[PDB]
Design an enzyme around this catalytic site. Structure first.
Site, mmCIF file in Angstrom:
data_model
loop_
_atom_site.group_PDB
_atom_site.id
_atom_site.type_symbol
_atom_site.label_atom_id
_atom_site.label_comp_id
_atom_site.label_asym_id
_atom_site.label_seq_id
_atom_site.Cartn_x
_atom_site.Cartn_y
_atom_site.Cartn_z
ATOM 1 N N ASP A 10 0.985 -1.257 0.029
ATOM 2 C CA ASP A 10 -0.167 -0.052 0.079
ATOM 3 C C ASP A 10 1.069 1.112 0.220
ATOM 4 O OD1 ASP A 10 -1.933 1.872 0.214
ATOM 5 O OD2 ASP A 10 -2.884 1.035 1.987
ATOM 6 N N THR A 11 1.027 1.919 -1.275
ATOM 7 C CA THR A 11 1.940 3.121 -1.321
ATOM 8 C C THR A 11 1.059 4.376 -0.841
ATOM 9 O OG1 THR A 11 0.720 3.586 -3.427
ATOM 10 C CG2 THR A 11 2.642 2.222 -3.389
ATOM 11 N N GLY A 12 -0.157 4.044 -0.292
ATOM 12 C CA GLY A 12 -0.817 5.196 0.383
ATOM 13 C C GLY A 12 -0.800 5.294 1.946
HETATM 14 C C1 LIG Z 1 -15.187 -0.348 7.817
HETATM 15 C C2 LIG Z 1 -14.813 -0.428 6.248
HETATM 16 O O1 LIG Z 1 -14.229 -1.627 6.044
HETATM 17 P P1 LIG Z 1 -13.509 -2.281 4.585
HETATM 18 O O2 LIG Z 1 -14.360 -2.055 3.500
HETATM 19 C C3 LIG Z 1 -11.958 -0.843 4.583
HETATM 20 O O3 LIG Z 1 -11.062 -1.651 3.982
HETATM 21 C C4 LIG Z 1 -9.897 -1.196 3.649
HETATM 22 C C5 LIG Z 1 -9.054 -1.635 2.424
HETATM 23 C C6 LIG Z 1 -7.908 -0.691 2.260
HETATM 24 C C7 LIG Z 1 -7.352 0.478 3.122
HETATM 25 C C8 LIG Z 1 -6.050 1.250 3.003
HETATM 26 C C9 LIG Z 1 -6.699 2.561 2.327
HETATM 27 N N1 LIG Z 1 -7.151 2.519 1.406
HETATM 28 C C10 LIG Z 1 -8.509 3.080 1.283
HETATM 29 O O4 LIG Z 1 -9.075 3.679 2.128
HETATM 30 O O5 LIG Z 1 -9.306 2.973 0.117
HETATM 31 C C11 LIG Z 1 -10.790 3.459 0.058
HETATM 32 C C12 LIG Z 1 -11.041 3.787 -1.023
HETATM 33 O O6 LIG Z 1 -11.072 2.693 -1.951
HETATM 34 C C13 LIG Z 1 -11.566 1.764 -1.246
HETATM 35 O O7 LIG Z 1 -10.929 0.381 -1.484
HETATM 36 C C14 LIG Z 1 -10.273 0.082 -0.369
HETATM 37 C C15 LIG Z 1 -11.155 1.097 0.802
HETATM 38 C C16 LIG Z 1 -11.805 2.297 0.159
HETATM 39 C C17 LIG Z 1 -5.216 3.497 1.797
HETATM 40 O O8 LIG Z 1 -4.446 2.862 1.007
HETATM 41 C C18 LIG Z 1 -4.203 3.850 3.203
HETATM 42 N N2 LIG Z 1 -4.854 4.827 4.034
HETATM 43 C C19 LIG Z 1 -4.276 6.096 4.032
HETATM 44 C C20 LIG Z 1 -4.971 6.991 3.051
HETATM 45 C C21 LIG Z 1 -4.396 8.173 2.775
HETATM 46 C C22 LIG Z 1 -4.484 9.244 4.171
HETATM 47 C C23 LIG Z 1 -6.507 7.162 3.207
HETATM 48 C C24 LIG Z 1 -7.158 7.631 2.002
HETATM 49 S S1 LIG Z 1 -5.310 4.142 5.578
HETATM 50 O O9 LIG Z 1 -6.373 4.769 6.469
HETATM 51 O O10 LIG Z 1 -5.719 2.673 5.678
HETATM 52 C C25 LIG Z 1 -3.586 4.050 6.564
HETATM 53 C C26 LIG Z 1 -3.574 5.366 7.698
HETATM 54 C C27 LIG Z 1 -2.169 5.444 8.328
HETATM 55 C C28 LIG Z 1 -1.131 4.382 8.232
HETATM 56 N N3 LIG Z 1 0.056 4.339 8.857
HETATM 57 C C29 LIG Z 1 -1.538 3.048 7.403
HETATM 58 C C30 LIG Z 1 -2.935 2.859 6.894
HETATM 59 C C31 LIG Z 1 -8.114 0.746 4.427
HETATM 60 C C32 LIG Z 1 -9.353 0.063 4.660
HETATM 61 O O11 LIG Z 1 -12.857 -3.617 4.778
HETATM 62 C C33 LIG Z 1 -13.683 -4.614 5.314
HETATM 63 C C34 LIG Z 1 -12.712 -6.036 5.766
#
Ligand SMILES: CCOP(=O)(COc1ccc(C[C@H](NC(=O)O[C@H]2CO[C@H]3OCC[C@H]32)[C@H](O)CN(CC(CC)CC)S(=O)(=O)c2ccc(N)cc2)cc1)OCC
Lengths: 99, 99
Positions: free
Chosen positions: B25-27
Site C-alpha cells: 500500500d503506497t498510500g
Molecule cells: C469499515 C470499512 O471496512 P472495509 O471496506 C475498508 O477496508 C480497507 C481497504 C484498504 C485500506 C488502505 C487505504 N485505502 C482506502 O482507504 O481506500 C478506500 C478508498 O478505495 C476503497 O478500496 C479500499 C477502501 C476504500 C489506503 O490505501 C491507506 N490509508 C491512508 C489513505 C491516505 C491518508 C486514506 C485515503 S489508511 O487509512 O488505511 C492508513 C492510514 C495510516 C497508516 N499508517 C496506514 C494505513 C483501508 C481500509 O474492509 C472490510 C474488511
C-alpha cells in the site's frame, strides 16, 4: 516515471479544468477526492476506509489526467483526508508495483 | 517482480513467526497489521484515514519478510480491517511505482 516511496507519492492531476495534488494509493480500490465542484450527474454512494464509512458523490466517466497520463473513469468526492488515486485509475495509466 | 493493479496487491508476509496476507500500500505511511499479540514494549498511536481514526500499538524494529525480501521497521498493530505494508517497509524491499 519511476517513483520511490521514501516520501508520499504525490503527483499533480487535472480534473474539471483544475490542477490538484493527489496521492497514488495502491491500497485504494477507488479514487476519492476532497470536496470540490465537478460538472456532471452524480449518485450518492458510501465507501469504507480504515476508520469506517463516509458518504460520497460518485461521478462516472470523468476525464482526469494523472502526471501527464489520461484516464476516464469513476471519481468519488467526499470527506477523504487527502486526494487519492486508486486502482480503478492507476490501471488506466499503466501503473505497476515493482521490486 | 512486477505486480499489476487489476486486483488488490496482496502478498504473503512473515512476521513474529507467523504467515499473513497483506496489501502493498503506497498510500499507507506506516505498516498496519491485524490484531496479533507480539511480545515487547510498544507505544500507543492513532492513525487516520477514510472514516476517521483507529487506535493501534506501535512496535519498532520488527522484522518482516515480504515475498522473500527481509525488512525491519515500525509495525502498527490494531483493529484494522486489512493488513497493509506501508511505505516505511516498501522502501526497504526496493518497491517503486512505475508508469
Ligand atoms: C469499515 C470499512 O471496512 P472495509 O471496506 C475498508 O477496508 C480497507 C481497504 C484498504 C485500506 C488502505 C487505504 N485505502 C482506502 O482507504 O481506500 C478506500 C478508498 O478505495 C476503497 O478500496 C479500499 C477502501 C476504500 C489506503 O490505501 C491507506 N490509508 C491512508 C489513505 C491516505 C491518508 C486514506 C485515503 S489508511 O487509512 O488505511 C492508513 C492510514 C495510516 C497508516 N499508517 C496506514 C494505513 C483501508 C481500509 O474492509 C472490510 C474488511
Amino acid at each position: 516515471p519511476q517513483i520511490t516511496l521514501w516520501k508520499r507519492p504525490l503527483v499533480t492531476i487535472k480534473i474539471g479544468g483544475q490542477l490538484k495534488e493527489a496521492l497514488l494509493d495502491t491500497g485504494a480500490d477507488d479514487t476519492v477526492l476532497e470536496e470540490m465542484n465537478l460538472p456532471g450527474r452524480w449518485k450518492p454512494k458510501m465507501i469504507g476506509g480504515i476508520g469506517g464509512f463516509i458518504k460520497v458523490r460518485q461521478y462516472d466517466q470523468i476525464l482526469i489526467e494523472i502526471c501527464g497520463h489520461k484516464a476516464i473513469g469513476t471519481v468519488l468526492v467526499g470527506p477523504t483526508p487527502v486526494n487519492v488515486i486508486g486502482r480503478n485509475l492507476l490501471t488506466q495509466i499503466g501503473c505497476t508495483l515493482n521490486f
